[PDB]
Design an enzyme around this catalytic site. Sequence first.
Site, mmCIF file in Angstrom:
data_model
loop_
_atom_site.group_PDB
_atom_site.id
_atom_site.type_symbol
_atom_site.label_atom_id
_atom_site.label_comp_id
_atom_site.label_asym_id
_atom_site.label_seq_id
_atom_site.Cartn_x
_atom_site.Cartn_y
_atom_site.Cartn_z
ATOM 1 N N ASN A 79 0.789 -1.242 0.000
ATOM 2 C CA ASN A 79 0.000 0.000 0.000
ATOM 3 C C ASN A 79 0.822 1.294 0.000
ATOM 4 O O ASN A 79 0.283 2.392 0.076
ATOM 5 C CB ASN A 79 -0.960 0.010 1.189
ATOM 6 C CG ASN A 79 -2.118 -0.951 1.008
ATOM 7 O OD1 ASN A 79 -2.674 -1.074 -0.082
ATOM 8 N ND2 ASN A 79 -2.464 -1.665 2.069
ATOM 9 N N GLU A 119 6.554 -2.286 -4.508
ATOM 10 C CA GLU A 119 5.589 -2.949 -5.385
ATOM 11 C C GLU A 119 5.105 -1.968 -6.441
ATOM 12 O O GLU A 119 4.165 -1.208 -6.191
ATOM 13 C CB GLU A 119 4.389 -3.477 -4.589
ATOM 14 C CG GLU A 119 4.767 -4.555 -3.599
ATOM 15 C CD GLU A 119 3.649 -5.522 -3.295
ATOM 16 O OE1 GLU A 119 2.506 -5.353 -3.797
ATOM 17 O OE2 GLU A 119 3.917 -6.445 -2.509
ATOM 18 N N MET A 189 7.708 -13.863 -3.222
ATOM 19 C CA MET A 189 6.329 -13.732 -2.739
ATOM 20 C C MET A 189 5.422 -14.716 -3.474
ATOM 21 O O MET A 189 4.640 -14.344 -4.344
ATOM 22 C CB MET A 189 5.846 -12.301 -2.905
ATOM 23 C CG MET A 189 6.680 -11.316 -2.089
ATOM 24 S SD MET A 189 6.048 -9.630 -2.063
ATOM 25 C CE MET A 189 6.515 -9.123 -3.680
ATOM 26 N N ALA A 190 5.584 -15.986 -3.118
ATOM 27 C CA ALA A 190 4.905 -17.081 -3.799
ATOM 28 C C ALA A 190 3.493 -17.300 -3.254
ATOM 29 O O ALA A 190 3.159 -18.349 -2.695
ATOM 30 C CB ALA A 190 5.737 -18.336 -3.691
ATOM 31 N N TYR A 191 2.681 -16.264 -3.426
ATOM 32 C CA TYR A 191 1.312 -16.223 -2.929
ATOM 33 C C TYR A 191 0.608 -15.049 -3.625
ATOM 34 O O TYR A 191 1.212 -14.370 -4.450
ATOM 35 C CB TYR A 191 1.275 -16.153 -1.389
ATOM 36 C CG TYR A 191 2.362 -15.337 -0.730
ATOM 37 C CD1 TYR A 191 2.421 -13.958 -0.869
ATOM 38 C CD2 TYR A 191 3.318 -15.951 0.051
ATOM 39 C CE1 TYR A 191 3.422 -13.220 -0.242
ATOM 40 C CE2 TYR A 191 4.304 -15.227 0.675
ATOM 41 C CZ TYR A 191 4.347 -13.869 0.538
ATOM 42 O OH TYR A 191 5.357 -13.182 1.186
ATOM 43 N N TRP A 337 4.823 -15.026 5.364
ATOM 44 C CA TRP A 337 3.919 -13.904 5.592
ATOM 45 C C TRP A 337 2.679 -14.486 6.247
ATOM 46 O O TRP A 337 1.904 -15.149 5.557
ATOM 47 C CB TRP A 337 3.525 -13.194 4.286
ATOM 48 C CG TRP A 337 2.790 -11.946 4.640
ATOM 49 C CD1 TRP A 337 1.456 -11.819 4.918
ATOM 50 C CD2 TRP A 337 3.371 -10.663 4.855
ATOM 51 N NE1 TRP A 337 1.177 -10.531 5.279
ATOM 52 C CE2 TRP A 337 2.332 -9.795 5.240
ATOM 53 C CE3 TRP A 337 4.667 -10.148 4.714
ATOM 54 C CZ2 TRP A 337 2.549 -8.458 5.529
ATOM 55 C CZ3 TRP A 337 4.874 -8.824 4.971
ATOM 56 C CH2 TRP A 337 3.818 -7.987 5.371
#
Length: 377
Positions: A79, A119, A189-191, A337
């Site tokens: 964010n 990001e 970030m495998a999600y 995470w």
Amino acid sequence: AKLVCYFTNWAQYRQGEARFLPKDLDPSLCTHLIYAFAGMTNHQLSTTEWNDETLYQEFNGLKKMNPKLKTLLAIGGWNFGTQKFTDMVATANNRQTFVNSAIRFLRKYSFDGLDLDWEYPGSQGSPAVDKERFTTLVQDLANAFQQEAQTSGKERLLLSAAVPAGQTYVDAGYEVDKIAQNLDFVNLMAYDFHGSWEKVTGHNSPLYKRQEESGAAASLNVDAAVQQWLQKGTPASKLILGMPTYGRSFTLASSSDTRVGAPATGSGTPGPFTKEGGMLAYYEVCSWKGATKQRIQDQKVPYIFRDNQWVGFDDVESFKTKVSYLKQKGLGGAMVWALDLDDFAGFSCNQGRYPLIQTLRQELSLVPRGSHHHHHH
Ligand SMILES: CN(CCc1ccc(Br)cc1)C1CCN(c2nc(N)n[nH]2)CC1
């Protein structure tokens, strides 16, 4: 092996048993703890919560109990946007301002390194030039950390980055082979592979493709993401496989079609503690009364449904399967995470404290030999 675990500085605002603070942290659970998130003010590292300074002391104070533990501070997050990163990397002067601020801030607050969570360079409003500028930033940080170690005689600050799994984002932002040389490790970030932005159900974090999938969809899985980062030049020992202690939820178009790929009309109902439609903590799905749990046989991960609600999540078994996978690929460890989304206090799942993260620790053969209070799953 590494077990890299994220702490979040907003989990302190959840209600009741879900409230999470540094005291709920187990100093011996993980090898590396990363604090999410710091921000940026005038190109300089800055706090984001009113009590971060208090929390930093508690968090880094964990190293008194476990001197082997390393801590890092993560800057940015999903964010945070891109503009502050873009403006900071735009000139050598601004990058120098940032790099020097990071060294001073990390040393002041007793962090062992910096984790980059932009990001993303080259996407989400960030211009194409930010791909090469991100490379330069990573190089600037690595070089400055090396220099500060030489001059100060202190242990060199670590540098990591949290990086996306999707090819669109990878190619727009990441000179993989170049950045991998300068990062100490790469947090994949495998999600968030699927979620309620899509019009059909799909799993947050499937290990493999479904037989039916084709085209780009066939790469939206952990194995494809890992292979992508390896083939593009990340040494396996530096690639750390992300693991979610949360799931993604959907409202089904019909309670009579609960398949993976069934029509969905939007996000699932918000959880009672996390209060964010489309997401649920493991502790909000592990004990769902009157629900039906299923496994996606191709993808090696569970889902669960009840009435018109459908959630894809990870359980002890899927974490075991993913650790077996990462060991077969020779990866450097697992990343998670997040601490506060596991059943950290054992208040929901009847599996003891931190059932998912303890599973990672076990399967990575990282259980302390002095440990008395662990639980094998
Ligand atoms: C948007 N994702 C899901 C966050 C989220 C998870 C569970 C719940 Br409940 C509410 C919100 C984030 C994206 C950033 N990810 C991340 N991983 C790392 N290493 N850095 N940033 C974590 C999942």
